[PDB]
From a paper:
To investigate the AT-527/AT-9010 mechanism of action we performed cryo-EM studies with the [name]-[name]-2 minimal replication-transcription complex (RTC), comprised of [name] and essential cofactors [name] and nsp818,19. The overall RTC conformation resembles previous structures, with one [name], one [name] and two [name] proteins. The [name] domain adopts a canonical right-hand fold, with fingers, palm and thumb subdomains (for review). As for all viral RdRps, the active site is formed by five conserved motifs, A-E, located on the palm subdomain, with two additional motifs, F and G, located in the finger subdomains.
Here we report a 2.98 Å cryo-EM structure of the [name]-[name]-2 [name]-[name]-nsp82-RNA complex, showing AT-9010 bound at three sites of [name]. AT-9010 is incorporated at the first position (+1), base pairing with C27 of the template strand. A second, free AT-9010 occupies the NTP-binding site, (−1) position, but is not correctly poised for incorporation. Palm domain residues Asp618 and Asp760 in motifs A and C, respectively, coordinate a single magnesium ion, which interacts with oxygens of the α and β phosphates of the second AT-9010. The 3′-OH of the elongated primer is too far from the α-phosphate for incorporation (6.3 Å) and furthermore the metal is not correctly aligned for catalysis. Rather, the hydrophobic 2′-methyl group of the incorporated AT-9010 ribose creates a repulsive hydrophobic-polar contact with the ribose ring oxygen of the incoming NA (or NTP), causing chain-termination. A third AT-9010 is found in the N-terminal NiRAN domain of [name]. Density and coordination distances between this ion, the AT-9010-β phosphate and the Asp218 carboxyl group are coherent, showing AT-9010 is in its diphosphate (DP) form—herein referred to as AT-9010-DP. The AT-9010-DP guanine base and modified ribose are accommodated in an inner narrow cavity, which is unoccupied in existing NDP-NiRAN structures. The guanine base is extensively stabilized by hydrophobic interactions and through hydrogen bonding with Arg55, Thr120 and Tyr217, residues which are conserved in [name] [name] sequences, but absent in other pseudo-kinases.
Residue numbers in the entry:
A (entry chain C): 2 to 73
B (entry chain A): 4 to 929
C (entry chain D): 38 to 191
D (entry chain B): 43 to 192
RNA sequence: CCCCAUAACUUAAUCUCACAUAGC
RNA sequence: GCUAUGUGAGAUUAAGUUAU
């Protein structure tokens, strides 16, 4: 569903900006290109791929702890 | 017959192949610049004399060499023979051959012209001035010959767009040397006519694409040395092509040869007046109107436009490093500064400040503010910059680091999104889906958006047409009062915005409005009328929702400019915003029946109404450098009493220096703006409105002139076309009678809602069908040659039914609803825009909905007319917003009961989730 | 007969209206104080709130690629670079233990993110390229277990 | 009954002049604050102007203004002729290959000896790390700072 | 760091005008 | 007449907010 993807991508980019990804210009450019491409997507199959690519930028680097964010 | 072919090629050894059949003539459909007592215009006619004979080379390959054997009466034949014999020795005259050949018993006199190209200059200028992407065969053939393309360049999708595939600037520029040689040959022809005593009118259709001239039928012989060639229509219609093809590029080389290296030019040299005079006397020698290289010597606004287009044509030869503020080392308190002491414009020439203080002992607040806003001290005291990311000229880097500004993504309102989803919104297949978001950008965003001024090119306008377009636009801008006002009467809203650069470093504009007394502001304004003050403008990235990934930048103009511009232009710009029922709809609210009022205003009395609109692609960055000057001149015409000629010219020069040729500061370094209006000057909306009235009146003018006058049934519009061509290319002074006329004609058949950059046109259908008023094709053709952009058909709309309003005006759709007992037009926006505004906010405080029941009342006010839309999903957004407002209020009350004990004395919050409060804002009673 | 219940109609409105303004000012102050408390609480807990919102929407998405990447990142495999989507480009992903190895890479394939990646260079903690051997059930003292597997997309 | 002056002029009229007296006091205080702001902004702009004249390098600028006939020169040639530092922003490695060189290149006549190269992250870029092989591994709005060599 | 212009809502005061009531 | 009080209509003035 695009309504649930184009919004969670915005949330992910906001979180990344909050945890100082703009310092690295290459990573910021890649993760802003992915975010813009998700927001303009027309097929959910190719939008989830870019959503996955936008993720693993937060997960690759151990900035935010992940075990407690999934207590639910 | 074969004997006719042998007779056509006589002494010359030419191998000819007939281009028709037998001895009969050949019919061609070419453009003509005709002016008779029956027809007058620049249109395409069928020429049915002329037996064309293409010449084939030795290897039997057809080349661009034709032998047009015109058949006409004996008297014209024998007169043209005498005129040719008088003009035989000129090197710019096509080789004529006069003979009589028996066709069927009558020896028809033949006038054979040897070795002339297939097309003429009239055909080229018509193709480039009446461009249609479907019927562009003549332009395609002209590009294929005189090698510019390879007949495969047209296989590209947007091979003409000037934005997509910006390589259409070349392929055109390759015709520049052809056009320049044509100009030299027509100057030679005029010299021969003057030295031989023949008086005649020069037309584009009488000169082939090689420069040769023919058709001496309408030439009269006078005493030798007293010839009077008429070169108004020729040069005037040729002007827009002189800059598309860049004809004056060979003048940048050592011996004016395209193979030799460029001229170096002293870096210090800035005058370039003798060079301009030499260029004018070489290419426009017989243009009888006086040309002033510097516009400071002009009479009243007419040499301003006239000499300014010549200056913008001639300034493409001179180095771009000489155009800018002229600095001089003045001594203040014995310490030498470096401050501007004039300005070198590409259109206004060299302008020198009249008040200069070389030896000063103390600087007042006005002098300090003037010196601090000048870019001289900032650029001189800054490192040299070579910014390869853009093609714009780089001046200096004020700071030792380059600033990269990134756009943050917008914040997500999960509460509103969850509430909407709970109410059956955002489902698979629903007509309302989220399409407006907060697009984020990387570091290379501000500079990338600034590098769109490459779409702004030096455009030379048709002065014989622009000088009448400006009169019609001035008539459109009547019934307004304007002039200069003191600092007492200046109204400023939201004082503390930016104050501009470098004034941001010390405070907002409130500080500079409070620190400067009223007499200080008046003295600063008076200084502007006698001096030129260049200012630095800062570019800032916008942070707002949009449906496109394109970044948006706004120009923050210095307060030193805005303070003077406000005093200059708030007597106007407020009568425009307080006048209801005029062409310009700036200031007219869309509430309380305003939309219906304007719509019924422009429906007016057109006999067969349709609707038409546009969006001006790549505006604010493709606007010609001449049309902004014309706009500022039109807005300065309400000054015949307060200001003199010198004061008005110096105010125009100041506006051009600090708005048009302004020093853009993108990031942390200074660049040079090639041209175009500023988004944030003082008059962006009104300058855009007058620019929109132009190129629409121009579209009407060259759609009414480009019609076959013999095929026009009505005897009134035919005479109107004849007199319009007269007033354009045969009349010098303004004919106020015929300016009031054709303006009444436009108002009767072409009604407009000219808001800034947005327009809706109610035009006569049967007049546009016959080509008597402007259409989509005519407007696109006008934009092609006077805006350097191709306007896509998908960016335009039309309506054949008036029960439905404009398709899209000011991003609001129009629908006819029943309000009470009468039908009215209500503007409803795109529901996706409202939903995106409700979901994606700028800050995190706005995510807390309880803190803002407000802004939701405001979003529901704009979303009320959707409740009457036939679509259920379109109608449900208003109910969604009302329910969310009620939920926000009730959860605020819950929070107040939890945090506090005291509730709120409310009962004036219920109106905010009832339809009656929002319905009352579209009923015309307030 | 008047001036008994009549005079107390304009002077009775005097103190009542004065109380009305006092209550109005008190309510205005209360709502201003509220609008501040909440605004400053919002702007204080922004990072945690955004992270919790993100990870709630990630589970509400109920995807497979995301639900595999996040499950691996919980207690094991996390990437070192952005996940490539083209059939070219390599992806390096740490494998912090034997179980994460066997859950992901089984033999020349890598699973991960709902695709199957072919492995190219199983380099150890330091750099020793481990050939696919000691990465079996036999006591794997393969250095510090982070066996960064470099893997290409099939 | 005739005591109106005791509460309509001794308690109301004697209070009426106080209102505009107080607003005049507030107006004069705000005028004093505006005058202080004017003084501080004057001293700030004067300090700015007197600060960025020492960087003018008044030995090669006096050599080009004096060379002018009328004494006026275009502003766009002052940095090209007098500035002792050059900043070059390179968007791609091809531009660096063409519009830049190793320790020394030439723009606007001159000879610009490169002193340091830095990236968008503004940390550092070594001169040996700018190659076709290593280009993708670099942020590439590269800023090159060079000094005029004379 | 965050432009010009227009419209609209919301709040808060002010200058009153006007209406009404009470007392004198 | 005189203050006193409320009333509604604005108008004026800033502040917040949206839309264009
Ligand atoms: C277009 C024309 F009308 C010219 O304008 C006219 C010559 O001029 P003209 O004296 O006969 O003109 P007109 O009768 O108005 O007087 O031949 C016609 N023509 C037909 N084929 C050709 C061709 O291949 N090349 C050129 N250059 N012209 C051609
Ligand atoms: C950019 C403009 F100057 C244009 O003169 C015109 C419409 O220009 P536009 O942006 O609609 O058109 P654009 O060029 O994008 O066209 P396309 O690229 O889609 O083809 O109003 C101005 N303008 C637009 N928004 C703003 C704004 O917030 N503030 C200010 N001060 N001015 C603005
Ligand atoms: Mg002719
Ligand atoms: Mg003729
Ligand atoms: Mg536009
Ligand atoms: Zn003139
Ligand atoms: Zn004036």
């Amino acid at each position: 569903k695009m309504s649930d993807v184009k919004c969670t991508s915005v949330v992910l980019l906001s979180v990344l900006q909050q945890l100082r990804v703009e310092s690295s210009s290459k990573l910021w450019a890649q993760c802003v290109q992915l975010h813009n491409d998700i927001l303009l997507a027309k097929d959910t199959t190719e939008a989830f791929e870019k959503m996955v690519s936008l993720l693993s930028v937060l997960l690759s680097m151990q900035g935010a702890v992940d075990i407690n964010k999934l207590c639910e | 017959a074969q004997s006719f072919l042998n007779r056509v090629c006589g002494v010359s050894a030419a191998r000819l192949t007939p281009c028709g059949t037998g001895t009969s003539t050949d019919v061609v459909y070419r453009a003509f610049d005709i002016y008779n007592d029956k027809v007058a215009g620049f249109a395409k006619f069928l020429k049915t004399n002329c037996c064309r004979f293409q010449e084939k080379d030795e290897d039997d390959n057809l080349i661009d060499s034709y032998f047009v054997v015109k058949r006409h009466t004996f008297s014209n034949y024998q007169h043209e023979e005498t005129i040719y014999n008088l003009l035989k020795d000129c090197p710019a005259v096509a080789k004529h051959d006069f003979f009589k050949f028996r066709i069927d018993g009558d020896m028809v006199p033949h006038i054979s012209r040897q070795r002339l190209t297939k097309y003429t200059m009239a055909d080229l200028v018509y193709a480039l001035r009446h461009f249609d992407e479907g019927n562009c065969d003549t332009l395609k053939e002209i590009l294929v010959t005189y090698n510019c393309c390879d007949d495969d360049y047209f296989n590209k999708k947007d091979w003409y767009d000037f934005v997509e595939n910006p390589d259409i600037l070349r392929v055109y520029a390759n015709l520049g040397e052809r056009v320049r040689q044509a100009l030299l040959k027509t100057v030679q022809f005029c010299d021969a006519m003057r030295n031989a005593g023949i008086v005649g009118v020069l037309t584009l259709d009488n000169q082939d694409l090689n420069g040769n001239w023919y058709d001496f039928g309408d030439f009269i012989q006078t005493t030798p040395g007293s010839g009077v060639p008429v070169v108004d229509s020729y040069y005037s219609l040729l002007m827009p092509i002189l800059t598309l093809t860049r004809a004056l590029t060979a003048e940048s080389h050592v011996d004016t040869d395209l193979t030799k290296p460029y001229i170096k030019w002293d870096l210090l040299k800035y005058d370039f007046t003798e060079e301009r005079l030499k260029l004018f006397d070489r290419y426009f020698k017989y243009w009888d109107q006086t040309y002033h290289p510097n516009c400071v010597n002009c009479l009243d606004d007419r040499c301003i436009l006239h000499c300014a287009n010549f200056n913008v044509l001639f300034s493409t030869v001179f180095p771009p490093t000489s155009f800018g503020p002229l600095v001089r080392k003045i001594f203040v308190d014995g310490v030498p500064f470096v401050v501007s002491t004039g300005y070198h414009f590409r259109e206004l020439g060299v302008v020198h400040n009249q008040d200069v203080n070389l030896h000063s002992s103390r600087l007042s607040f006005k002098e300090l503010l003037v010196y601090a806003a000048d870019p001289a001290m900032h650029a001189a005291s800054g490192n040299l910059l070579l910014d390869k990311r853009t093609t714009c000229f780089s001046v200096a880097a004020l700071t030792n680091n380059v600033a990269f500004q990134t756009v943050k993504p917008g914040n997500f309102n999960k509460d509103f999104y969850d509430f909407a989803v709970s109410k059956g919104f955002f489902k698979e297949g629903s007509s309302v889906e989220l399409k407006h978001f907060f697009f984020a950008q990387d570091g290379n965003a501000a500079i990338s958006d600034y590098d769109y001024y490459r779409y702004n090119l030096p455009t030379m306008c048709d002065i014989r047409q622009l000088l009448f377009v400006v009169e019609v636009v001035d008539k459109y801008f009547d019934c307004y009062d304007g002039g200069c006002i003191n600092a007492n009467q200046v109204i400023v809203n939201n004082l503390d915005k930016s104050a501009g650069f470098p004034f941001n470093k010390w405070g907002k504009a409130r500080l500079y409005y409070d620190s400067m007394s009223y007499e200080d502001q008046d003295a600063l304004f008076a200084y502007t009328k006698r001096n030129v003050i260049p200012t630095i403008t800062q570019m800032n990235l916008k942070y707002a929702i949009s449906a496109k990934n394109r970044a948006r930048t706004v120009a923050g103009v210095s307060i030193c400019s805005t303070m003077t511009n406000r005093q200059f232009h708030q007597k106007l710009l407020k009568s425009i915003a307080a006048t209801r029922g005029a062409t310009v709809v700036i200031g007219t609210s869309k509430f309380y029946g305003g939309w219906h009022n304007m719509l019924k205003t422009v429906y007016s009395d057109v006999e067969n109404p349709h609707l038409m609109g546009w969006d001006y692609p790549k505006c604010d960055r493709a606007m010609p450098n001449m049309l902004r000057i014309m706009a500022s001149l039109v807005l300065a015409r309400k000054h015949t009493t307060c200001c003199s000629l010198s004061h008005r010219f110096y105010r125009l020069a100041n506006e051009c220096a600090q708005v048009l040729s302004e020093m853009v500061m993108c990031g942390g370094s200074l660049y040079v703006k090639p041209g175009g209006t500023s988004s944030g000057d003082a008059t962006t909306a009104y300058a855009n409105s007058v620019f929109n009235i132009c190129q629409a009146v121009t579209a009407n003018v060259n759609a009414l002139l480009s019609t076959d006058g013999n095929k026009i049934a009505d005897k009134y519009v035919r005479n109107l076309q004849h007199r319009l061509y007269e007033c354009l290319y045969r009349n010098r002074d303004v004919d106020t009678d015929f300016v009031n006329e054709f303006y009444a004609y436009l108002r009767k058949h072409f009604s407009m809602m000219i808001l800034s950059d947005d327009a809706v046109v109610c035009f006569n259908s049967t007049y546009a069908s016959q080509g008597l008023v402007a259409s989509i094709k005519n407007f696109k053709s006008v934009l092609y040659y006077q805006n350097n952009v191709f306007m896509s058909e998908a960016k335009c709309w039309t309506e054949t039914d008036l029960t439905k309003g404009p398709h899209e005006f000011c991003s609001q759709h129009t629908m006819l609803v029943k309000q009470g007992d009468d039908y009215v037009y209500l503007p409803y926006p795109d529901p996706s825009r409202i939903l995106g505004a409700g979901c994606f906010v700028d800050d995190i405080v706005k995510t807390d909905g309880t803190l803002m029941i407000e802004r939701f009342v405001s979003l529901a006010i704009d979303a009320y007319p959707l409740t009457k839309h036939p679509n259920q999903e379109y109608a449900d957004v208003f109910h969604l917003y009302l329910q969310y407002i009620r939920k926000l209020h009730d959860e605020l009350t819950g929070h107040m009961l939890d945090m506090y004990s005291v509730m709120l004395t409310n009962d004036n919050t219920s109106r905010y989730w009832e339809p009656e409060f929002y319905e009352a804002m579209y009923t015309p009673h307030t | 007969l008047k001036k008994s219940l009549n005079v107390a109609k304009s002077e009775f409105d005097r103190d009542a209206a004065m109380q009305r303004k006092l209550e109005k000012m008190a309510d205005q102050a209360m709502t201003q104080m509220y609008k501040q408390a909440r605004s400053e609480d919002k702007r204080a807990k922004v990072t945690s709130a955004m992270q919790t919102m993100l990870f709630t929407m990630l589970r509400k998405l109920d995807n497979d690629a995301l639900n595999n990447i996040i499950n691996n990142a919980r207690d094991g495999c996390v990437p070192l670079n952005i996940i490539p989507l083209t059939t070219a480009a390599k992806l390096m992903v740490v494998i912090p233990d034997y179980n994460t190895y066997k859950n992901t890479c089984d033999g020349t394939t890598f699973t991960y993110a709902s695709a199957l990646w072919e492995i190219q260079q199983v380099v150890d903690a330091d750099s020793k390229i481990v050939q696919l051997s000691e990465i079996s059930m036999d006591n794997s003292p393969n250095l510090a277990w982070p066996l960064i597997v470099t893997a290409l997309r099939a």
